[PDB]
Design a protein around this ligand. Structure first.
Ligand SMILES: N=C(N)Nc1cc(C(=O)O)ccc1N1C(=O)CCC1(CO)CO
Ligand SMILES: N=C(N)Nc1cc(C(=O)O)ccc1N1C(=O)CCC1(CO)CO
Ligand SMILES: N=C(N)Nc1cc(C(=O)O)ccc1N1C(=O)CCC1(CO)CO
Ligand SMILES: N=C(N)Nc1cc(C(=O)O)ccc1N1C(=O)CCC1(CO)CO
Ligand SMILES: CC(=O)N[C@@H]1[C@@H](O)[C@H](O)[C@@H](CO)O[C@H]1O
Ligand SMILES: CC(=O)N[C@@H]1[C@@H](O)[C@H](O)[C@@H](CO)O[C@H]1O
Ligand SMILES: CC(=O)N[C@@H]1[C@@H](O)[C@H](O)[C@@H](CO)O[C@H]1O
Ligand SMILES: CC(=O)N[C@@H]1[C@@H](O)[C@H](O)[C@@H](CO)O[C@H]1O
Ligand SMILES: [Ca+2]
Ligand SMILES: [Ca+2]
Ligand SMILES: [Ca+2]
Ligand SMILES: [Ca+2]
Ligand SMILES: [Ca+2]
Lengths: 390, 390, 390, 390
């Protein structure tokens, strides 16, 4: 009988470097003989023995004949699939866990937990799966597209925590947190503080007592709402990050937003999921973030870091760590996960590189990875190498 | 040495929701690069560690060149194949267990048992397989298409029970039950009661002492013959279900059949295999059934439920639970199986969604799944998303 | 540490029935999307946990571009490959063990032993492989196409026995036997008796003290040379079978060969590998043989059996058991192997069904299987279902 | 908990024979249905239970649409992939370990260690991976294409040794050695002696105290620099081999280079990685080398051997052992690895057979293997069997 998964100290290191790239459409030529699935919202989650590359497929492949609708998000064909990290997600390589248009997954040291959301926008549903068995569900509370993270949930000692949210994308979406255990929701936490809008949270353990999240506000601010969940008391609390380096997209020039740490500024309506991961140290804490290069568009991607301080009250601009993707290459959703080494965890940042060619063609993505290893500075940037017209 | 499989209490819950969809032909475009097998009569069966998606292939794929004959049922090329639940049944993903045009399978907690039927219609044969070894056979008694369930057999404490049947589809087909153990038939039970016609039974444990089956009568009634097998004495007994919600197809308006619980009514010649599964509770019993939406055609699919009572004498109409498939989408064979969680069994209903385009083209099917999870009502319906002309 | 494999009593039963068919070219249409390997000389061998389908590929696939030369036998591209029994041997499904144009394999209860032959016809070489390591070799003695069985070698208590042969196909080819152990040849046996010609032997355990073989004589007789190897003393001895049902192809009418059990009769130059397997009983011994239906051509295939007696002196015609393949369907090489059940061995007969369309096109084969199971008579025959022009 | 890997005595034998060939492009016809990856610099490395076929892919396949650039070496798309030895490295069969344009790997008896190099030529990076976790990095010291072996690193008792090098290909490239343990570099050795140029080293254990390497000098000599690393003191030392059979390409006639063992002779600018492996004996040492057949071009490949002596001072010409590849067939990079049998190691020599058709088409390679087994002489040569125009 295996033991439960706990957050440990991150491995020694001080910089991020190009780790691996997964460009399934470098094989989808009309001339080729492969069949990569058309997907979006990819994310990596790892257990003690393996890392898995999850994603949301449109139950279609390239080359294929159902490209129409792949640019849309919610529908009755969307499914959450996954391949082992390092394998091209093809029709046969892949595994379909369930039907869903929003999802998350996390391993608890013993078994996998898959989360999926599907159903009518006004009464959607969150379905928990433990291994091969469907174990539970959660209903919509705001009755407007119940959705989840699009990144790994976080398990500790057997209890897993997962952010959920219901509401308008241009209005109010108060997020919620579910304390899931062995597939069954044993609790539902109501966060305190700034909650006008909080979705697509990238959560991770800052320690054995706290989980933090860098989220997305789609209608009020270019600042990223920041969650701090006290695992010990299952209580949460949110409030806009205070640094000058706004991590959302779109966003105004750094420092452009006048006022205290709670000022939303101009709506800058819209947003994007941002990478975020922790570097746990015996007496210090590293916080790595990623943000698109273009301020208005999803192009490029840079890495930031800030050791210690309270993101809630620290307005000091973050430290630039590197360019993971140039402005000529797509830089869309991003996320964090942590590989488990023998005695330490390895913080990494995955990046969704969408191949957008309009609604008239297929719409898929590549997944570039970057992990903490060694010292110095980020050396190389990433490219998908795909030519959509093939 | 593993221990034997026993039926346990179902997991807590009170509604069925869309679980997973397997549409292998969403990848069989002339333009694509995949190779899904052309099949029919799919069914899921699970062991303690995994669920497998079995089916009957025509040893052909799409796109391919042997579409002629795939709409026929019995032949020398038909084989029983299976992939793990969650994988697309393709030429390479699949495993061929044996040659057969009728089949069943069930895991006994230790090893898989595959059942296959093939041979001349007048002297067909039932072949039992235990793991990789061919272990036994059973001959035709009525000498007219010896056939079996097309759904999982049920094992308890090591002994597995399987319904078989021989006879005319428009005449008399007295079914039989085989008590198989470790691949060898240690008994053959002769059911009592209504037996003029009883085929394609969907059986499952109602408890540790009884196995129940919702079967098909192809020539006498629109009511479903109902089997109750006393596992403790290996004795059976059949008699037409008594509810007003006739579960066969075709069928007349509910309550249309005048008379007592034994009235067959108009022949309504023909039928279809219907889903059926048990929800075991400490002091109550849930019985879930499925029936096509159209009364005359195999279109649509709805879920029913009836807690307690004797289906043999209860004429009270079943309770509508939801629409798993609309009348615009194919709703063919259906069936039940139960996923094994750590401490409870999860009742599910699989549905065969055939892609019928006439005998002039390929004839294959998708498999939509629905499982008990959480409460409330069924939220979403299922679609194959396939456009046969591609 | 696993224990060594020993021959046990066969499972109870008294007839052979169609078990499984492997027609990889039912997916090689120019229109399809699969890639089955072009092969020949297939054979199945099983260990305690799995059966494997070995064969000799021309390192080519259908559809493909290297069909020229596939009808030839020996060459520098031929490799011995294998897939698990039940999987289609495709480019990706397959595993390449070594380069060879003649081969054999057998599992000893602990690890697999692969045998391969390749090299110049005048100085060919036999290479033994144990798992992933190349362990030994044996040189040509007659200096004319050193070749081996094309069926499984037989291991007992850890020592494996394998027939080898060197010589002209139309002249003298004295076969030899190698006692291999853990990959290394610890002995070389020189058979006694009739040895003018003895190749492609189908060997199997008649007991814990004797291995028997039905072989092929390519230039002297239509009778099959018969080997009896005393495992206990590692001594052999050969002499033409004495039944009237000649099992070679070509062959004259049964009983046509005048004289005693040693008469070769007319050369009937040429031959074919024939199926042969043992049915071990507490006090009786079943011997099953297969022979093409046509006397002059490789078409059709029938099953024979003879309980007890000495094939060396028994001239009584064998008992016809059934038609595994009609005269309209190809019936080429055949062979025997035995599946291992929990407490008994299951004798089976595999059949090579070649798709011969001349040297101007591809030349591949299907593998039909038949195993002992239950009683009565053989019910169905086998067909490849392949239309070479697709 | 498994124990550490140590070098043992090689298995008994005295000759090399054709073992296995991996020609993935025997399936890349425009007409076929397969997808082999376009690669280069292949190499095999084995652990106690399996051998893996690593290589450097251009993230492209045949047939495909990105053939331009595959003839170039360094780029942002190159990745180190690997399949189990015996499987065709296809898009789906393969696993991508990391992004790199130079690499190495070795198993330490417990877990795999993958090494990859990528980044700007002037500030490249060496990334160590232990299983699924990124563990360490090493920076460029000469600031000119930091690169590594292109063959397996060598682990002993848990510590693994890997040659690295930085410098000009036509100038000075002083190589370095990294003592890696559990993914982390615990030491960096600076070799003594001739070091003007030393790259692409083929290293292997000559004993439990010494690792030897046959390297490449790209700008000064046709003689192969020879490394001897004292594992016991982690000290190294290099000096040009002294035999008359120059093993580099290009090279002048044997014995053409006048002078003592340290004479570089004419630049013969350029080189190639050469095969080299040890045959450990109780009291003797076999050293096997390979060298292209043509003196000026990468065509053909022959095997050499020299028992005992000091390659540093022995000028006696090596003993010709055989022709693994004729002058009509490509003979490019070559390398050594050792399969692990139950009680001994099996020395083998892999050969890279590039399919060069100019920069206007794809550029991929086949991998022919040869291993020590039995006695006598090398019997057969190897051919790719590929016709690039298909
Ligand atoms: N309002 C949103 N942020 N929605 C949203 C926006 C985008 C985009 O801008 O590209 C993509 C997907 C979604 N999503 C959906 O459409 C339903 C689920 C969800 C991703 O799983 C949001 O979590
Ligand atoms: N009389 C029947 N119910 N036969 C039957 C009917 C249909 C259909 O109406 O679609 C499909 C398959 C069968 N079957 C066969 O043709 C042989 C086996 C069997 C399914 O495995 C019946 O169990
Ligand atoms: N003389 C023979 N029997 N040779 C022979 C004949 C045929 C045939 O008639 O179809 C096929 C293969 C072979 N073989 C070869 O060509 C080399 C090896 C061997 C099969 O592995 C013979 O064992
Ligand atoms: N100077 C060299 N020897 N470079 C070199 C030469 C060739 C060739 O001549 O064919 C091929 C690859 C490389 N390589 C590169 O381009 C970067 C890494 C490396 C192989 O991994 C050299 O180790
Ligand atoms: C970040 C951190 O220190 N996490 C601790 C880990 O070191 C410890 O081994 C474990 C025990 O449950 O709890 C957690
Ligand atoms: C439905 C039901 O109660 N089934 C019982 C299960 O609870 C018990 O553990 C088992 C022991 O054999 O027998 C069965
Ligand atoms: C055919 C036969 O009887 N074979 C015997 C088997 O029953 C016995 O268990 C074994 C022990 O080594 O030896 C063999
Ligand atoms: C080449 C050689 O002799 N290697 C030795 C091996 O025999 C021994 O078993 C091992 C113990 O660590 O050390 C090494
Ligand atoms: Ca925003
Ligand atoms: Ca494939
Ligand atoms: Ca009916
Ligand atoms: Ca003959
Ligand atoms: Ca040189």
């Amino acid at each position: 009988e295996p033991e439960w998964t706990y957050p440990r100290l991150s491995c020694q290191g001080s910089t991020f470097q190009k780790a691996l790239l997964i460009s399934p459409h470098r094989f989808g030529e009309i001339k080729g003989n492969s069949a990569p699935l058309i997907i979006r919202e990819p994310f990596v989650a790892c257990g003690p023995k393996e890392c898995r590359h999850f994603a949301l497929t449109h139950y279609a492949a390239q080359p294929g004949g159902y490209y129409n609708g792949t640019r849309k998000d919610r529908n009755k064909l969307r499914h959450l699939v996954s391949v082992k990290l390092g394998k091209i997600p093809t029709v046969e390589n892949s595994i379909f866990h369930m039907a869903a248009w929003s999802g998350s997954a996390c391993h608890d040291g013993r078994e996998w937990t898959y989360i999926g959301v599907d159903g009518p926008d006004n009464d959607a549903l969150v379905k928990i799966k433990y291994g091969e068995a469907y174990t539970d569900t959660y209903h919509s509370y705001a009755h407007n597209i119940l959705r989840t993270q699009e990144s790994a949930c976080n398990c500790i000692g057997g209890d897993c925590y997962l952010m959920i949210t219901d509401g308008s994308a241009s209005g109010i979406s108060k997020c919620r947190f579910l304390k899931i255990r062995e597939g069954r929701i044993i609790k539902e936490i109501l966060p305190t503080g700034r909650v006008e809008h909080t979705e697509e949270c990238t959560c991770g353990f800052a320690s054995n007592k706290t989980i933090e999240c860098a989220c997305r506000d789609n209608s009020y601010t270019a600042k990223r709402p920041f969650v701090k969940l006290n695992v010990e008391t299952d209580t949460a609390e949110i409030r806009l990050m205070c640094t000058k380096t706004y991590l959302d997209t779109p966003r105004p020039d750094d420092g452009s937003i006048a006022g205290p740490c709670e000022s939303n500024g101009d709506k800058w309506l819209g947003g994007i999921k941002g990478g975020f991961v922790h570097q746990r140290m015996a007496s210090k804490i590293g916080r790595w973030y990623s943000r698109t290069m273009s301020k208005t568009n999803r192009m490029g991607m840079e890495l930031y870091v800030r050791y210690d301080g309270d993101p809630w009250t620290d307005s000091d601009a973050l430290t630039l760590s590197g360019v993971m993707v140039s402005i000529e290459e797509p830089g869309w959703y991003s996320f964090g996960f942590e590989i488990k080494d023998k005695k330490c965890d390895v913080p990494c940042i995955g990046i969704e590189m969408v191949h957008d060619g309009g609604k008239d063609t297929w719409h898929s993505a590549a997944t570039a990875i970057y992990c903490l290893m060694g010292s110095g500075q980020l050396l190389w940037d990433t490219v998908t190498g795909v030519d959509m017209a093939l």
